[PDB]
Amino acid sequence: PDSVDYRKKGYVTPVKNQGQCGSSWAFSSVGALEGQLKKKTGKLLNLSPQNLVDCVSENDGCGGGYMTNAFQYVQKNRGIDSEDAYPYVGQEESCMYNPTGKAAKCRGYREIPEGNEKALKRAVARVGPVSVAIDASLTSFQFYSKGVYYDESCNSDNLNHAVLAVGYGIQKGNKHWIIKNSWGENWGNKGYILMARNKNNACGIANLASFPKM
Ligand SMILES: [Cl-]
User: Fold this and answer.
1) How far apart are CA 197 and CA 73, in angstroms?
2) Are the beta carbons of 176 and 148 closer than 8 angstroms?
3) What are phi and psi of 13, to 5 degrees?
4) Rounded to the nearest whole angstrom, what is the distance from the C-alpha of residue 64 to the centroid of ligand 1?
5) Phi, psi of 166 (to 5 degrees)
6) Quick one: DSSP state of residue 176?
7) 192 Cα–ligand 1 center, Å
8) Dihedral in degrees, nearest 10, Cα atoms 162, 166, 172, 174
9) Distance 180 CA to ligand 1 centre (A)
10) What is the distance in A from the centroid of ligand 1 to the CA of 172?
11) Cα separation, 114 vs 75, whole angstroms
């Protein structure tokens, strides 16, 4: 069985909802950090995307951002707050980080070689959940309900949405990535989508992948 589902292993927190704020980069980043918190310490908790929205000046808050900028921030800031200590409000505010609420740390990051789905698979297997960016603009993506998603019109050069690869596997003969979104449990299959794997880097799944070192 060349498959892994980190949701079964306790590496994945409940699905969140970014609301009316283009902060999927922040949810993708905290998801990867949460997975490494479980792996390194044996337990996890919800980390603060609002911490990243307000304090990662290299990104654009609700206007977009990159996950490696977030990992670099957590490293140089010497921590990121828990969700409970720094709760999500769906809009950018002044940076209110407090070391008293520190719940995770970061020693750097690694970017997966661009477009290499085999390297992405090895990273998911050997690290844990990996932050990724995809083209999520298609209507077919947005109304996804079940099965393995593949749409030929997906633009690997148009990465517009950050998500989290929490595993991989195969379903009815179709290889897939298990993808955690940030559009609520209401979206997709309880917040998740299975995206085609080894189909010429569909939707750019392996073009902007990274994970934090802890
Ligand atoms: Cl394979």
Assistant:
1) 31
2) yes
3) -80, 170
4) 32
5) -100, 10
6) E
7) 21
8) 50
9) 21
10) 15
11) 23
Q: How far apart are CA 122 and CA 49, in angstroms?
A: 27
Alpha carbon distance 58, 65 (integer Å): 8
Terminal CA-to-CA distance of the chain, rounded, Å? 28
Amino acid of residue 211: F
Which conformational region is residue 154 in: left (phi greater than 0), alpha (psi within -120 to 50 degrees), or beta?
Answer: beta
**What separation in Å is there between the alpha carbon of 198 and the centre of ligand 1?**
8
CA distances from 11 to 111, 112, 193 (A): 20, 20, 17
Question: Which domains does the chain carry?
Answer: 1-214 (3.90.70.10)
CA 131-71-156 angle, to 5 degrees, is 35
C-alpha to C-alpha distance for 153 and 168, rounded to whole angstroms: 22
Tokens standing for residue 63: 């206007």
Q: What resolution in angstroms, rounded to 1 decimal? A: 1.8
Alpha helices (H) along 128-192: 139-142
